[PDB]
Amino acid sequence: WQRIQDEADELTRRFVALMDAGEPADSEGAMDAAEDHRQGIARNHYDCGYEMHTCLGEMYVSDERFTRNIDAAKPGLAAYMRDAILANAVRHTP
Numbered sequence: 404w405q406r407i408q409d410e411a412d413e414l415t416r417r418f419v420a421l422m423d424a425g426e427p428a429d430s431e432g433a434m435d436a437a438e439d440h441r442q443g444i445a446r447n448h449y450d451c452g453y454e455m456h457t458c459l460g461e462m463y464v465s466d467e468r469f470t471r472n473i474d475a476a477k478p479g480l481a482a483y484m485r486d487a488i489l490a491n492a493v494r495h496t497p
Contacts, residue, residue: 407447414440418484419477428483429490437491453492460488 462469463484474481
């Protein structure tokens, strides 16, 4: 497919779908999604990096430039995602 963009968009729906259920971002399914999230991100470049994952959490809310674009497809998804990243990361490394 060579389309390394639509794949990321599947995650948003996947994460957002969690919001729809209002599951706990610490949901194994959600967190497992975090594992998938990290796996797909790291797979594109670099490798294991829970820390680099935490770094993206910043843009998911920091720098109104990125926050504004991400959350544009759903309100508050950015804030919720930040919660998602750390919980998965924390069970691995607090």
